[model samples]
Target: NEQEKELQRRLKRLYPAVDEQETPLPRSWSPKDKFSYIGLSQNNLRVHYKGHGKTPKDAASVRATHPIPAACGIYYFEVKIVSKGRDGYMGIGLSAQGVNMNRLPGWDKHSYGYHGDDGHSFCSSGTGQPYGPTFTTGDVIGCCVNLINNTCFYTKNGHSLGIAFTDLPPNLYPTVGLQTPGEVVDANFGQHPFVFDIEDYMREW
Candidate 1:
């Protein structure tokens, strides 16, 4: 087991991500920080997907605040795809204020998402377009949004995948979405340093 954990550590060195245990909750999430329609649990660090029967809500997603804010300088965050249920899907990215809550944030024109399974990029009006790594349950994805320049970037584990979107909405918030039953993720919004030290990259931009 120690060897297995060591191998994972070495892999993390190759692909970094925020270490959630070291990052505390920024403050118990307020009403303003939660999703418009979905319920959050695990002290707001974790989110659950709610939909009719087996389908995920058509356009549902959640956003970040203060600790990160909207359209303010350069911001960085990450989502750990904790689990993926049957047909479970997830996206991580930046989105505008009016993003459709019933669909994945990036499904709307104002948002940009990097899907977990296919590593495709999603935005305002289209479906999967080749972009980055194909992630799965338990992988961590990073996002860097520069409000000052209207650009966005993504990372798998810790390695920067480079810029993924441009000319983003003026006010974009770090966001995540879950589709299908039992899908979940944990979010990190600069509350503490990441294991891969994405802070360095986030600050430079």
Candidate 2:
């Protein structure tokens, strides 16, 4: 039982070390910061489109409760497509406060996103540039912001899609937009191990 006791001792010492770290991660979606069509689950990590009789132009976006802290040096999060629904028109990116939530993140000013249907990167504009392959149901998309370089990128299924944005501004919140009925996604705000090797990327960069 001495080995078990040693393990318990290490476990007891682990929590305080984690608590001492001051980095703040976006833990959940902000209920008040989302569009009317976006619905948050009990934990606020799962997002879904709740509106009915939606048209093609209808879109809904939601922001995380906390913005990515520049002090963290680098911040990353992932979202899994739970349901692609009719068209899988989804956007995953970041945005500043007061941006229009009725449109996809990149379609508005000060917002950015990597869309699923077209696999394009939108940088605060309605138009998108080709970036990656289309993502659909069951795919995991990761968004990463490098504060040190003022750049951002996206990953699909643990593979980096290269830098999609540059000159990122501060206080941008992790955001996602959904169109079409039944679209759903689950966010990973550093609560669980990421699909991508973030530690390796940090070391390499």
Candidate 3:
């Protein structure tokens, strides 16, 4: 039949484009809810956020984020928090064009829990809000990320919660924020101006 319809039209033009609601792949995230959002680029570089907990969430503080441009795969994230007492610790990172958490992967030396194990280096959520969750002013939290190291995962929801980074802190690229629990760096979490995305999200993931 004409060479089997020209080999099914060259396999529908080399197949690649699934979104029957997401094509399913890359799901297994936890932090509860409050905040945990990520989205790296240069091809499917991801890390999602949105965690929950409360009671001692203040440790160190520094934030400025913008995420998007991931077409390789595996990503989801959200962040929300308001804090009331002791249960907060936060750190989630990614940087480029100027990212060098001293070149992460272990930030220099000292590993444990993703490499060595002993209290995550960063990319944190909560555990210090005390015991009351339901805070959103720009502290909206949600997270998920499974890049498996990169290349084609194809998620739809536009970088989940990463977009337009505009604060190049002397060459800043990676930024995650939340602090107001245990106490560190002037402790206080009222949450502020929060919401991220690289391309899209209709809600309810």
Q: Give the top-scoring candidate (TM-score).
A: 2
Q: Encode model 2's per-residue lDDT on 39-122: one tens digit a residue.
A: 899589899987762674689999998787666677788999999988888999999989999888899889999999999999
lDDT of 3 by residue, 59-85 (tens): 221222333223323343333333322
Error of 2 at 173 (Å): 0.3
| Model 1 bad stretches (over 4 Å) | 1-37, 53-59, 65-72, 202-205
Task: Report, for all candidates in order, the number of backbone clashes.
Answer: 13, 0, 75
TM-score of each: 0.74, 0.87, 0.24
Error of 1 at 14 (Å): 23
Candidate 1 per-residue lDDT, tens place, 60-179, comes to: 577764333442355566777788754557778766776665667578778788887678898775576888878868778888776677778888887888788888766566677777
Candidate 3: 10-residue stretch with minimal lDDT: 108-117
Candidate 2 clashing pairs, residues 3+ apart or interchain? none
Q: In order, what lDDT does every prediction score?
A: 0.65, 0.85, 0.26
Candidate 3 Cα outliers beyond 4 Å, as residue runs: 1-24, 28-76, 82-87, 93-138, 141-194, 200-205
**Ordered list by TM-score, greatest first:** 2, 1, 3
Model 1's lDDT to the true fold?
0.65
Error of 3 at 165 (Å): 12
Give candidate 2 regions above 4 Å deviation.
1-23
